[PDB]
Amino acid sequence: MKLTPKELDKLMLHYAGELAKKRKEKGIKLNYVEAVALISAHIMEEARAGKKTAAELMQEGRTLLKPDDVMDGVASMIHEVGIEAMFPDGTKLVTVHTPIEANGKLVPGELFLKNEDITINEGKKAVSVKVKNVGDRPVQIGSHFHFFEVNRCLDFDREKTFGKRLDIAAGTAVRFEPGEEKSVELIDIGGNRRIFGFNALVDRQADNESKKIALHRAKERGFHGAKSDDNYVKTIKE
Amino acid sequence: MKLTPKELDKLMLHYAGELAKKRKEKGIKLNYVEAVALISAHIMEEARAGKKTAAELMQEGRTLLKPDDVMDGVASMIHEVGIEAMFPDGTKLVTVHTPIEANGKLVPGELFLKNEDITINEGKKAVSVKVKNVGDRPVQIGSHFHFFEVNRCLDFDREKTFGKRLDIAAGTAVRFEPGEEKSVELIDIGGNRRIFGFNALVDRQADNESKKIALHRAKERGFHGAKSDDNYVKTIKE
Amino acid sequence: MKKISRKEYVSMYGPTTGDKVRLGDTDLIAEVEHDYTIYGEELKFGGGKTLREGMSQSNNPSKEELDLIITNALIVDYTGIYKADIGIKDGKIAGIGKGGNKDMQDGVKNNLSVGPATEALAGEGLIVTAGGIDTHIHFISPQQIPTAFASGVTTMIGGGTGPADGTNATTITPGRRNLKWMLRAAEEYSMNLGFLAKGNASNDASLADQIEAGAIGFKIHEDWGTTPSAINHALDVADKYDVQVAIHTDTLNEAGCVEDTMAAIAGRTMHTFHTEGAGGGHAPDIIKVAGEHNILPASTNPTIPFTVNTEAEHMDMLMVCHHLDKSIKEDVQFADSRIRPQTIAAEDTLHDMGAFSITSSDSQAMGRVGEVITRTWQTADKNKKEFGRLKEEKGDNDNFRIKRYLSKYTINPAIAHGISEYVGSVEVGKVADLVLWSPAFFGVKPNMIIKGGFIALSQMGDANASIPTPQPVYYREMFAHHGKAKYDANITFVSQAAYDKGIKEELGLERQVLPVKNCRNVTKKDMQFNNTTAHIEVNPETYHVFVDGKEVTSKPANKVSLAQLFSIF
């Protein structure tokens, strides 16, 4: 029976589960592991019998342990239980979300952040800009992305956006449904203000003069809102 | 469920146990392993449930298998079963002593030593010496330790003990409770009689002349019974 | 300059200043003291995140371009419990601060520049701490290494040569030959190693060779004969060779009492093991030694924390360590007059007062090689319970106490054995031995153990799955644990003498190899936080432990944090 290391992994897990079930049975509040296992182990058999579906087990797993079954803290700990089992249609990932609940007051590593708010991008004079997606597909722009160089579909005043990024939480972004129109918030790029890459429009220092070029290239490259070439005077490098 | 190699070790042991219990159940005399496991595995669960204490399980384990349960020899073999399990207060070492008994006649590797007695330290003229512990703490001196240099508390005639060791079984020792007074037995040190180390009193050849120095140093160093300095004539090396 | 709510912010970047984190399930509350970020410029990796070309990742990096960034990491180190980005380069902590792309970021030093060459490791929400350093390892079986590693222990200093009796009793790798073997064996493992020699010898010659042979120090063990002579000899050579020395006091008191032992140490630096007593030593006093300046006090392991079952446990152990065959008369008398619930109790308190400085293990010899860090924390949580916060504590948190219990298995042991320069704390310049801790499992179950700036082992799931998260999720060795790679990520410590004599080449060591230094110039006052000196006494009768005058004794516990809540066994 050519046993794949994957299979052994499970055969092990399974019994990790059996112990678990066998313990509460004898009336004992299950802990982190014990819960996790149990939950997991279940799905594995359920997938075996080939009855329940993934969508289902994903849910039914939330009905395996009552808040009075596990130890105080366990509930909060298991944010979720991921486990792949082999269904007649093939292996699948059953992700069981929050299988138990806060029937207790204890929460390991709980957070006591001090109320109040943090101000993103301190003193950074923002600016609003109309932005409509004139394309058939959606477009998500990011925090520190040179807005000016966004997809050649977001129609807006590139000129007003040169050297700036969506004034938002570092990391996140903004979505544009084909057609959708909005007014984004965008502050200037800090640091040395050295734009390099993206759509190859700048690749230099954010200068009011470098700008001329970007605006020119975007025109030729087709980005909506990229003004026009009012008799452009070429430079010796661009 | 971050499984520590320690945990897997157990999950394995546990089932080693389950098989065990499951076997006798079906009416079969358990062997060395099977017994060991079973016993062990038990404690592990018992510690889990968090009811019984270490002191208790240590004892209760002796009530898990009757002399008619295991195979002939098993009893004698399992001198004891050590197993650490995690109690609500933390992991603890439950040592179950002699869990079963000689309800059989067989004893693997049994010893058939030939009656009679062995004479320790052949022809080695012994000597008795009064020894009282004038200190507040106890003191255990060993077989091959230069007695003369024992703790500066055992009051006795160091002089009479120079170059000698407690005439007793090689390895063992003698205990002195603060206050206790006895007369130890001590033969001369054999071999080349080269004392080096201990309390730094000799560090040479056990000589009647080297002795003078030891006796002198012990005097200055404060060891009880170390006679006195009757106008000590110093040597060129000491 | 829009503004967001902490609620959000934290789930995005992690606890920031003023915020507090609960260490595991213990009542120990940590509070972010400082933060090096620039709200709005924080580093985030992912789909459309920040760490991307020309953005947070410079297309014009500094000629210091980081190898790896641990973004938004909550740092809990004896140097502060703050927030910031931790940078790694060439297997070391290259920088600790903001970092990102100077082309688009306000305060990024070329020290922490992110470039095409730097990998990204998220850390927001986690607690990064240096690897622990268990220094009372009995090399009984190579299996301890991995276990200890899974704990949060990157460095193991001990003596021994495998399941042999001499080793089962003492942490000593005797002679230069046996030394060769272990050093050569060490090559195999993923865990910095250093070995101790047999201080038990009044033969200067024989005492110096072991150090010239790779030993980072000596060990004076009772089973070998901890006599004032040996004790003195060992000590002196130790001085000459600038190496550390450990000791296991003369229990039987045959040669003399602590009075004598201390008199022997002649004030010289000395790292004492199981100072408390149960671990072994001058009955009953000894623990009193932890109050002297020249002494480097260390606590064993089992007798910590103090629970209802502790005392009931030890009774045995002695047998399986000193060959105290359960039968002989002389044996069955002292073994009982050593496990004093008295000394055991004060310990915890002594640990709180800074009376004790290090928390060993004694792996397989009256100590759990995988329970050093855990216990150190329990013992802390406990003490807080019974004694509450501390006078030195400032603000509504236990930071100070934290930083005390932490440096007990990190910066303090590292100093104890002259290797604080390379490892032992999250400070720029040192070796990148780090471990990321998921707050909920702090002090017991770490997320990953990165050795020498590269992942060596971490929590890993179903290797066949579509993601690393799915069970079974236990610890799995990682790349820096294999091939020649291991060689690059580990350090086998030795002495200068050996280092200079070329012990590395001598023994064909492929592992990194550094020399231990500054071991004779240190004293109790050199122990971070736990630098308290104080004349202590111990009633020969009641056995009660006194310090400065007052009496110290903790109350036994009936339950402890960081336990059954996390392990199926």
Added chain:
Amino acid sequence: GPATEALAGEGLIVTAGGIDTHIHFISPQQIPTAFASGVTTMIGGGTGPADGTNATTITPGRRNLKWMLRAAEEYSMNLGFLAKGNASNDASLADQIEAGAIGFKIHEDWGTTPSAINHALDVADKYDVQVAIHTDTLNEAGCVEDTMAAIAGRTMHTFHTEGAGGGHAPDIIKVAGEHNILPASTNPTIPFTVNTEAEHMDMLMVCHHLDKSIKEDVQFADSRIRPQTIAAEDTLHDMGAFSITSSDSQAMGRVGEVITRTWQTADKNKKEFGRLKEEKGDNDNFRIKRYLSKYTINPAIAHGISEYVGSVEVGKVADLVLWSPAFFGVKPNMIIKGGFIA
């Protein structure tokens, strides 16, 4: 002769080792598993369970490159690593190759922009090395129109072309129809079963750090797992529209289910579509030889190593695997590496 050992093979089916080329070096444990499959060669990028690796198959920089190459020594499975194509710094782009990398990788999480895309591509040309890509999903910089325009017709090995694996929503899969493109299918979205779609919804989270909560995140992750593109895939694989079957080990793909699925997907297609027009005689040889070279000769060529390995032809490295007919496509008898049982 006296020197030659004997290995029986009568009754068995001998085939070359598979070559999974979309490996995310997240954990050294995949190697062995993949090996048990019938995979002798693994081409990917990464440095262990670190986020950058969990998202993309890229071993960034020459230093990290050193580590892995040095680590590789440990394993029993041919290895090759990819570099961070995500950089518009030619200099920084060339060093990684000079540092052992067999190519580049352009991943969305790192910023798959036309600039990066172009730069990477050019250097790749100069150094005669392959280049993989994970299309710009969010379409922030532009759409496939743009990406393809960037590739400027140059050779490009595309991953999870289909879409679910990631990329320019929704088009992308359309890229698999162009000449200059080296189409490759992910893994989970193959074959197409009732539970496929129900599965993916999650995965995205555990790959792009798409924390299950944020708004912008909980919008595209849903507009990417199209039962549409997922479906055609299988067919595209039958039509020869797709050429390679990756895995994406631990990142939306089963490192031990490449070969298996490739076959299922075949069996399936036959069911619904029957034999093939190109088929000759009462058998499925042609179709077989199609699905087979999807994880053997085609990936080997994709990364310039078809000379040594990738097919049972005289001269090449003896990476073979004996398959007992009954367990074909799932459980191999033995994996011989470099002419000797491993």
Added chain:
Amino acid sequence: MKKISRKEYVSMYGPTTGDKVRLGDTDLIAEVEHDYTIYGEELKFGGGKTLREGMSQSNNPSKEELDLIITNALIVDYTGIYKADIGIKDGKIAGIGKGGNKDMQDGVKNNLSVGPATEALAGEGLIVTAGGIDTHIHFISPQQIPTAFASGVTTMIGGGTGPADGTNATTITPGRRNLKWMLRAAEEYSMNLGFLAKGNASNDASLADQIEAGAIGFKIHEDWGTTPSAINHALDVADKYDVQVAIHTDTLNEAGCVEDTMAAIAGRTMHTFHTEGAGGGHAPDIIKVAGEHNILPASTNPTIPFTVNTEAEHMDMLMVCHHLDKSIKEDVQFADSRIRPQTIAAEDTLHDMGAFSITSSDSQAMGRVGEVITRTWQTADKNKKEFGRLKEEKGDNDNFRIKRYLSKYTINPAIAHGISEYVGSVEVGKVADLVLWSPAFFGVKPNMIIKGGFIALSQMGDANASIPTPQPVYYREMFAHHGKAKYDANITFVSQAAYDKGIKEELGLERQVLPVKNCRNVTKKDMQFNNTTAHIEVNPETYHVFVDGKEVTSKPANKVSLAQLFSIF
């Protein structure tokens, strides 16, 4: 814990926190911001002083034992104007803090331990500052070196090959051959050296070799043809080789105007010389360039500070630099339309506003190689007079302004030419190029110049006398200025390329040799304090210099500090 009076204390250990010092005879007031000592444990050397065996000097030093201690030193560096002990080891700043003997001192890190091996140098009462770095040196005559050295200048970056015309006009050592010569010559001197190449060439090939040949960068000079082509070419190669580039704008405007030049620089990093104008360049604008981000503004020398005689002076100079023979028509027209009292004036102000960042010299080519530091300070004192303190100033002192004018010839030029890692400021880790300044003579006459952690030259008296104090007291070369010693204490900078190609061995250089790095990634914002950007204009008519809108112009002075009060000539 007795207590003493500041009166005393200071005369004993020097100005401590809260205390203020007057820089030379200028109205510039410095204030001790911080102090690392431990009142009662401060280091003092002498007769029965503190630095003695077993006392302040450990008999059990750390395995880091310092080479030299500069006790009680008032540190005036861009990183703060504080108090503390400065330690030197292996020709570098090993530590900056307390230091002494851990055996008897409360807070001494092994970083600053004093031992039998560490020499003692008193510093209490003096002001220690890093060596200046003149970066606009015209290697016209080897005699400048020594002079500049006597100033407080330890590093000289320039181009040239001796009193040849090409050199008299521009700071450029053309070709790899001439490069060899100078590098080989440099061996002779006591003053870190780096040479620039002829950026004036549109031949990429010819442009790359000079760098591969030891040049730390390029120089585009008007006399050679500062055309957009040359300008572009030079710039690009400069990028590829991560090296700096200087420029002397196209005055005659033949090819175009600054509009064009700036357009050529294409935003790339560029270190501009005599930006102001008189030093040379695009008349009249140019100075306007100092307001752009990508530009590294630098001021010449003579046109600073602004006195009644400045303008009356320059009229000539032009002749003896551009071969502008006093006669020809075309010559006698622009030379007059370049010395604008306008641009000259604003300069000072621009220097105060942070508009300008570096203060060159142009040694022997419209600049005094021995008056960089002096003027930089005068110009400061002056500005304070006319404008008073600064808005950013805090407390009753001019610290901020100080730290601005200081980093103008220290940390800012060092960064300008990628050598800020080794030198340019009193920070741990860098090369020990220090100079002790006796407050009274600050900014003009330094006490001693220690190079690479060892005295190279200092004020010395009657070599025959019974003490070093007695006249004649001028500067005398010191040991680290002779023998092989010089080789160990100096650094001749070059490029990576060359460094890697082994230029050192190639040319048999015995001098220390490091490569310049991180030169293309920097911008104006990378200039300490003087990091202000601001669109400036210059009326083609009135020639008035405008910034952000307002007008800037300093008033000419009729007398200056740090002058006739100190030199007989």
